[PDB]
Design a protein around this ligand. Structure first.
Ligand SMILES: Nc1ncnc2c1ncn2[C@@H]1O[C@H](COP(=O)(O)OP(=O)(O)O)[C@@H](O)[C@H]1O
Ligand SMILES: [Mg+2]
Lengths: 637, 167
């Protein structure tokens, strides 16, 4: 019993009593676990015993304890965890594992990168952001072994600890695995009564956009324990909060005699996956009730389809039908999985082709910034293994494993392909399978695997002459094969025809767009660039929370809500419209930019379903089918 | 030959550049004499003494001092165009397209060098670049006229070298 330990425990009791949010969070975890246990008893999921703690609240309550948490976490985190366990045990007596702690908030000088991690930060709580490059196999670690002695018919047990389990060092007492009892009787291992805690080690390298352009990168190992396991995949941007620890003896013992130094790693307490641009982490936003009410009150309006569309990229003049197509693609339709395993597409593919300087790349860059899981690729820059997958070899097991390409990484997401015309044919015929079957089949030497590639694709192409020609055949203008043309749901030809009034209006719009100042910025000061890393949970300038046209942060709240919540179902009144329009398009005498197949019918169904998603309707209506039908007519005529 | 016929790459690459210069072989006696005199001045060392004298005078600035000044003006100044400087740009942008439209309608062949909205943003960038020299937070009409003159000297005369862009 240590007196300063008890004093720190009592101080964290006072902090937990003052801030009732953590008191409510412990109770909310406990009622969820007890309700699931009662459901399993009567007729699932379990929540881990750890609490998110704000460092700013602790700093306001007690600056000494906050600086103790940051600077000497070994002396301050175990008292606080003991205090949290005491609180949870005092409340859970009426309805066993000790409670853990996680940390959020500003870290100040402790917000570092793997390059910025130095030996002065050892034995300190640090928050480190980077990219996950390597992850190890999840391995169980024996904590208590249970054994049976058949001669006496009794169960024995032995507890095992290692240096990574405790923040404070302890005298290492290595107790061997018992095969005798104290009297010499044979022991048999009771697998299933023993306890094994999951253990992982990941490598966090500094982000390639925050790393210097010529230097070799710096990384650090992070050890994760039971409930922090498998919260990451390789390629994720992460923020790991944990204690920068030194372990063992750096060769000072006689047996060791070498200059690896003291081995250093982060004992992770907290792992936040971060959303960065063109990464595999999907952007998510926490929806408050007020935002849900705003989304629902916009849903009842009649002009909601012409309000969200024009508010996508208001800094681009024209392309009004393309904005509608991008919105319906972001809604993304409903995927059908039949009882015999046959799959039907839900997502919408858009090809744009036409004259240069027509804001195609700007639209691609907008979709890269406004979509939750958009990944940007270029034509010749990416390759066949670049988009689909590749096979490499890991160091430990020596067996071949898979590296996921851009299409696999953008599963349930968005692929923005610029310079679609300049792509190699091998990667084309790779893309044929992805855009329809929505899967990637790898048949390499020894490995045969099917990966999910459920993706929306936006493509920007150019005509073979550099400029679109009205008098020439559009098949001659695009010069793309028929099978790729059929995959894309909507194909838009954007010609830079020039008229005096239109050039006047575009010139005024661009000139008034270049005269924008951000709020809080001086007239002469340059706008600074801060890279956007968002936490993933689970032409008028003054648009402020749905006055006329919505903000981009609110618009992706609407898209997220419509994607998770409503799953519209097709009905007869939409079916008649889409059947009539499909028959008319199949038997039209007019020449079309896009060929007409049975794929256009499913395009009509997906577009009607996507428009129903905009209205937050559980049913697809006639008005959805007609707008989906005459949106297709613009892309064809 | 056309300007797009002379280059060994796609004509759409030209549209991505803000200012394109076509450097000419003058083939004139008096220009050749002057350029030969200048190169002999450089090789003799008279150019070094003259440049040092002008740097003492101040009509020429030092390279390191220019580098540090460029860094200073890049971090400090970011000019904005005035509203009275916008309508002149919108007129001087639409007159080029008015000439180009009737030229391409008469010829019925598309010009090898195009004028696009990216060229409008290019003239905007030139205008806000001239004001960044003066550490001026406001781009005025006097910068717009110099930007138009610079665009005439580079992109427009190269476009007039194209027979389709001329006429
Ligand atoms: N309709 C338009 N409205 C606003 N800006 C435009 C428009 N068309 C082109 N631009 C501007 O011209 C520039 C040229 O880039 P972009 O048009 O995206 O090239 P491309 O069309 O060849 O992909 C962009 O910065 C964009 O802002
Ligand atoms: Mg482009």
């Amino acid at each position: 019993p240590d007196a300063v330990f008890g004093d720190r425990v009592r101080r964290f009791q006072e902090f937990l009593d003052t801030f009732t949010s953590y008191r409510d969070s412990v109770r909310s975890i406990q009622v969820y676990n007890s309700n699931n246990a009662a459901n399993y008893n009567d007729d699932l999921n379990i929540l881990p015993h750890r609490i998110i703690i704000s460092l700013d609240d602790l700093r306001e309550f007690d600056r000494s304890f906050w600086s103790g948490i940051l600077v000497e976490p070994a002396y301050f985190i175990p008292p606080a965890e003991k205090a949290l366990t005491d609180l949870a045990d005092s409340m859970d007596d009426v309805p066993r594992h000790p409670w853990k702690l996680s940390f959020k908030g500003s870290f100040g000088a402790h917000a570092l990168s793997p390059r910025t991690l130095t030996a002065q930060h050892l034995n300190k709580l640090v928050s480190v952001e980077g990219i996950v490059t390597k992850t190890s196999l999840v391995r169980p670690k024996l904590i208590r072994s249970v054994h049976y002695a058949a001669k006496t018919g009794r169960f024995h047990y032995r507890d095992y600890t290692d240096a990574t389990t405790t923040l404070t060092t302890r005298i290492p007492t290595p107790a061997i695995y018992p095969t005798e009892d104290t009297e010499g009787n044979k022991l048999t291992t009771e697998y299933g009564y023993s306890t094994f805690i999951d253990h992982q080690r990941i490598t966090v390298q500094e982000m390639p956009e925050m790393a210097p352009a010529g230097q070799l990168p710096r990384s650090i190992d992070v050890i994760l324990d039971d409930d922090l396991v498998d919260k990451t995949k390789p390629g994720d941007r992460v923020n790991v909060v944990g204690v920068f620890k030194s372990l063992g003896a750096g060769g000072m013992n006689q047996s060791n005699s070498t200059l690896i130094g003291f081995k250093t790693l982060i004992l992770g307490n907290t792992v936040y996956p971060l959303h960065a641009r063109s990464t595999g982490v999907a952007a998510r936003q926490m929806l408050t009730d007020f935002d849900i009410r705003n989304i629902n009150k916009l849903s009842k309006k009649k002009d909601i389809f012409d309000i969200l569309s024009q508010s996508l990229a208001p800094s681009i003049y024209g392309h009004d039908h393309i904005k509608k197509a991008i919105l319906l693609m972001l809604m993304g339709g409903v995927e059908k999985n039949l009882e015999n395993g046959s799959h039907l597409r839900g997502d919408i593919n858009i090809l744009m082709v036409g004259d240069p300087s027509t804001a195609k790349s700007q639209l691609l860059r907008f979709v890269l910034n406004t979509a939750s899981l958009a990944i940007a690729t270029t034509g010749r820059g990416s390759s066949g293994v670049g988009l689909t997958a590749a096979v490499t070899t890991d160091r430990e097991t020596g067996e071949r494993r898979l590296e996921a390409g851009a299409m696999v990484l953008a599963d349930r997401g968005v692929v923005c392909i610029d310079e679609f015309d300049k792509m190699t044919d091998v990667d084309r015929v790779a893309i044929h399978e992805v855009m329809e079957q929505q899967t990637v089949t790898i048949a390499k030497a020894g490995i045969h695997t099917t990966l999910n590639a459920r993706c929306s694709v936006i493509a920007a192409a150019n005509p073979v002459f550099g400029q679109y020609d009205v008098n020439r055949d559009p098949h001659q203008n695009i010069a793309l094969p028929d099978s790729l043309l059929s995959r894309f749901d909507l194909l838009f030809v954007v010609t830079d025809d020039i008229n005096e009034i239109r050039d006047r209006s575009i010139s005024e719009h661009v000139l008034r767009t270049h005269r924008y100042l951000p709020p809080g910025y001086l007239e002469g000061e340059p706008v600074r660039e801060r890279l956007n890393l968002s936490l993933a949970v689970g032409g008028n300038y003054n648009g402020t929370e749905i006055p006329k046209l919505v903000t981009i942060p609110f618009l992706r709240k609407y898209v997220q809500y419509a994607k998770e919540r409503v799953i519209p179902q097709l009905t007869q009144e939409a079916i008649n419209v889409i059947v009539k329009n499909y028959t008319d398009l199949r038997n039209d005498d007019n020449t079309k930019k896009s060929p007409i197949t049975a794929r256009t019918l499913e395009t009509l169904i997906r577009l009607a379903t996507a428009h129903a998603k905009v209205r937050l309707s559980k049913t697809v209506n006639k008005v959805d089918a007609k707008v989906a039908a005459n949106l297709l007519r613009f892309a064809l005529l | 030959k056309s300007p797009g016929d002379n280059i060994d790459f796609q004509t759409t690459i030209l549209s991505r550049f803000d200012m394109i210069f076509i450097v000419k072989d003058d083939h004139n006696e008096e220009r050749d004499i002057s350029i030969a005199n200048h190169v002999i001045n450089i090789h003799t060392g008279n150019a070094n003494a003259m440049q040092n004298q002008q740097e003492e005078n101040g009509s020429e600035i030092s390279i390191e001092k220019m580098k540090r000044y460029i860094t200073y003006c890049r971090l400090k100044c970011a000019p904005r165009l005035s509203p009275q400087a916008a309508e002149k740009l919108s007129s001087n942008f639409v007159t080029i397209r008015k000439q180009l439209l009737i030229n391409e309608l008469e010829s019925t062949e598309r010009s090898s060098i195009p004028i696009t909205i990216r060229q409008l943003e290019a003239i905007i960038r030139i205008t806000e670049s001239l004001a960044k020299l003066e550490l001026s937070p406001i781009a005025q009409e006097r910068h717009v006229d110099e930007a138009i003159r610079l665009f005439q000297a580079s992109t427009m005369d190269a476009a007039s070298q194209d027979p389709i862009g001329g006429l």
